[PDB]
């Protein structure tokens, strides 16, 4: 017959190979498809949908519907943060379980811009201005509005348009970041402060909640498929 020479790699089974194989059920009459609504072509499409962030992971609130609610009040102006977060979308406990974080945990690298949308759920009679901020890594994490205001920030005025979006631009040294907590590929800090204060008239609730949402921008991508730690199996 035709002279052949077997090269190394022969008879192995690479779990990620892409070869042809014989069909065990030949000439099978396959049921044709129908146009079912909601078809998906890329996993990144799912990462671009707003998903609610479990921002309040305090012991009494974590693992309850309260982990999603961050409460505000009509107290006099303060320069202390309403919330603090680290830009580690796949590893920070508050981001790791969102739809975005879930997908990132099936990949080793991520790159791109993100956007955080906040919804004000107070009454119509409530007003206020808030400062949402993003500080690229390398300096002290902002602890006062004075430090936060020096980085990327959006001053949100509450009114008819109930929500406000802050885009966290892709500012990185490496071309891709890792989906694990690693200082070399650290992303920075997200924080919120009161710009003025929440003001309500009489006969109106003085405390109300805001909900946060996170999604990927159109320049977001992931690579190196890996296994997630979000699912296990004992015995």
């Amino acid at each position: 017959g035709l002279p052949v020479l077997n090269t190394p790699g022969s008879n192995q089974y690479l779990t990620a190979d892409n070869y042809q194989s014989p069909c065990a059920i030949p000439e099978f009459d396959v049921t044709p498809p129908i146009d079912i609504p909601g078809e998906v072509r890329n996993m990144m499409e799912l990462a671009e949908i707003d998903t609610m962030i479990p921002l309040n992971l305090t012991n009494q609130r974590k693992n309850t519907m309260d982990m999603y609610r961050v409460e505000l009040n009509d107290a006099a102006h303060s320069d202390t943060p309403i919330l603090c977060l680290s830009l580690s979308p796949a590893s920070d406990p508050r981001l790791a379980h969102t739809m975005l974080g879930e997908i990132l945990n099936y990949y080793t690298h991520w790159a791109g811009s993100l956007k955080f949308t906040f919804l004000f759920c107070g009454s119509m009679m409530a007003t206020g201005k808030l400062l949402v901020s993003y500080a690229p890594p390398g300096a002290e994490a902002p602890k006062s509005r004075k430090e936060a205001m020096l980085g990327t920030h959006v001053i949100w005025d509450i009114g008819l348009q109930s929500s406000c979006t802050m885009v966290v631009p892709w500012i990185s040294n490496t071309t891709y970041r890792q989906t694990i907590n690693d200082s070399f590929t650290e992303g920075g800090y997200i924080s919120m402060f009161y710009q003025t204060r929440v003001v309500v008239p009489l006969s109106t609730p003085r405390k109300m909640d805001i909900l946060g949402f996170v999604s990927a921008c159109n320049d977001f991508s992931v690579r190196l498929l890996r296994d997630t730690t979000h699912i296990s199996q004992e015995a």
């Binding site: 390398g138 300096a139 980085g151 631009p169 892709w170 500012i171």
Partner: protein, 262 residues
């Protein structure tokens, strides 16, 4: 001629009447990031004349017994005017440099200094613990450091120095110093020239990086032929180092970084 030059950057000018040409490292002149090589999406800051000018670091003195000196970039310039300010206010930073080393003597003096510009100039430590040198020691700033004639292991377990121990003939990194000529360099041989001038483009495996975490270039000065004069066992001539950052662009502005010291 090959010997007379004038360098003007911003509000600073340098003149020399005894040069030996100038070296442009790898034949590349510093440049800004092109859109096709861009990474961070935010608008960069380019201080231009305020940062791209000649800064004179501290003068060192050459004696018959000197083993050599070293500096790290951008580290040595971290406290230099508005260049240092921009470096600390931004997460990312990029810059090229014009290094001008100065050393004049007389026609009756001898000695030759090898001036090398090394990309990723990693130095050897002093302990049995690997990569143990601490941040504060690795980044001396404008004062830089010195080479030693021999390796001396730090044994104080209670209070380890966590410092470098760069042996001169081993180029401070376990390679023979005579082979350091594969790096962009010039030689200041007292009978020939006053200075050495090197133009360094930005070199890295990324287009932009953290200037506080990473030093791109290292400047090493080694006495190839020791200093000697007439009959004065006693001879000292200063070596002044003037460096100018070029094409500075920073990305990722926030609050200022204040690194831990000493």
């Amino acid at each position: 001629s090959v010997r007379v030059m004038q360098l003007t950057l911003g509000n600073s000018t340098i003149t020399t009447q005894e040069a030996a040409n100038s070296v442009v490292a790898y034949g590349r002149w510093p440049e800004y990031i092109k859109d096709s090589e861009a990474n961070p999406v935010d608008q960069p800051t380019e201080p231009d004349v305020a940062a791209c000018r000649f800064y004179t670091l501290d003068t060192v003195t050459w004696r018959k017994e000197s083993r050599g000196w070293w500096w790290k970039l951008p580290d040595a310039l971290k406290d230099m005017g508005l260049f240092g300010q921009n470096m600390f206010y931004h997460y990312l930073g990029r810059a090229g440099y014009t290094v001008h080393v100065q050393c004049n003597a007389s026609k009756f003096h001898q000695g030759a200094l090898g001036v090398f510009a090394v990309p990723e100039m990693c130095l050897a430590g002093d302990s049995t613990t690997h990569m143990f040198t601490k941040y504060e020691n690795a980044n001396p700033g404008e004062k830089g450091g010195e080479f030693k004639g021999s390796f001396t292991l730090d044994t104080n377990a209670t209070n380890p120095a966590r410092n470098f121990c760069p042996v001169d003939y081993l180029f401070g990194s376990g390679v023979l110093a005579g082979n350091a000529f594969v790096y962009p360099h010039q030689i200041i041989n007292l009978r020939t020239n006053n200075c050495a001038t090197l133009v360094l483009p930005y070199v890295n495996s990324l287009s932009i990086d953290s200037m506080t975490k990473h030093n791109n270039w290292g400047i090493a000065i080694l006495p190839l032929a020791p200093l000697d004069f007439a009959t004065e066992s006693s001879t000292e001539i200063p070596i002044t180092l003037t460096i100018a950052p070029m094409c500075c662009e920073f990305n990722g502005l926030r609050n200022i970084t204040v690194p831990r010291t000493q």
